[PDB]
C-alpha cells in the first residue's frame, strides 16, 4: 500500500500469536515493542533514543506479520513509549520512502 | 526519488543558510535539529521518545529545503543526537511510505 504521513503511520502486526498496533519508523534501526512476554531466550541490551538510553530484552529470529506481510527477525522488548517497527524489519517487507 | 532502507535514510537539507544531513523519520511528529544559533523569537518546549524528554526551542515558519524540495514549518532546536526531519515537513514534500 501507499501510506501518506498526515497521521502517524500505524499498522497492525501479529507477534507471538497476538495482535498489536505499531508505528512504521524509518528513524529506528531496530524494532522495539513495549513490555510483553515472548517465547525463547533473550539477552539484555541497551538502545538509545531522543532522550537517552534504556535497557531492553533482545529476542532473535521472531516471526512478525506486518499488514499481512511476513518477516522474521530481531525484536527488542522494553519500556518504549510506543511500539515501533524499525528498518531491520521494514527492509524485509520491501518498504521504501518516496517523494 | 525512492529511498531504500538498508541504511539510515539521510539526506541533505538547507536551513538558515546552512546545509546539513538529516534523517527522514516517519517516527517523528516534529522536525528536530541539533543546536544551532538561528535568529528570531522562539518558545520553550519538551519533546520525548525512547529514553525520556529533552528541552528544545521552537521556531515557527522556517524555510527548509529538502533534497531540492521546498517546505516551510516549525523547527525545534535542542540537544538531539541527530538532525531529524519529521512528518510536519515530510507531508509538505509529498513523501510516502510504500510496500
Amino acid at each position: 500500500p501507499q501510506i501518506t504521513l498526515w497521521k502517524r503511520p500505524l499498522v497492525t502486526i501479529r507477534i507471538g500469536g497476538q495482535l498489536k498496533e505499531a508505528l512504521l519508523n524509518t528513524g529506528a534501526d531496530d524494532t522495539v515493542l513495549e513490555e510483553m512476554n515472548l517465547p525463547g531466550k533473550w539477552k539484555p541490551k541497551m538502545i538509545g533514543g531522543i532522550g537517552g538510553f534504556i535497557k531492553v530484552r533482545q529476542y532473535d529470529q521472531i516471526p512478525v506479520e506486518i499488514c499481512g506481510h511476513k518477516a522474521i527477525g530481531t525484536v527488542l522488548v522494553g519500556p518504549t513509549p510506543a511500539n515501533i517497527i524499525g528498518r531491520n524489519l521494514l527492509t524485509q517487507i520491501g518498504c521504501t520512502l518516496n517523494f | 526519488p525512492q529511498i531504500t532502507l538498508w541504511k539510515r535514510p539521510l539526506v541533505t537539507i538547507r536551513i538558515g543558510g546552512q546545509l546539513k544531513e538529516a534523517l527522514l523519520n516517519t517516527g517523528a511528529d516534529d522536525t528536530v535539529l541539533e543546536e544551532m544559533n538561528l535568529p528570531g523569537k522562539w518558545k520553550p518546549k519538551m519533546i520525548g521518545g525512547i529514553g525520556g524528554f529533552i528541552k528544545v526551542r521552537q521556531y515557527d515558519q522556517i524555510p527548509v529545503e529538502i533534497c531540492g524540495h521546498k517546505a516551510i514549518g516549525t523547527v525545534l532546536v535542542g540537544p538531539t543526537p541527530a538532525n531529524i526531519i519529521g512528518r510536519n515537513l515530510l507531508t509538505q514534500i509529498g513523501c510516502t511510505l510504500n510496500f
Binding site: G27, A28, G49, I50, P81 | G27, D29, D30
Partner: peptide
C-alpha cells in the same frame, strides 16, 4: 507528549 521515536543501537 512522546512524539519522536528516533532509535539506534550503541
Amino acid at each position: 507528549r512522546p512524539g519522536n521515536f528516533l532509535q539506534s543501537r550503541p
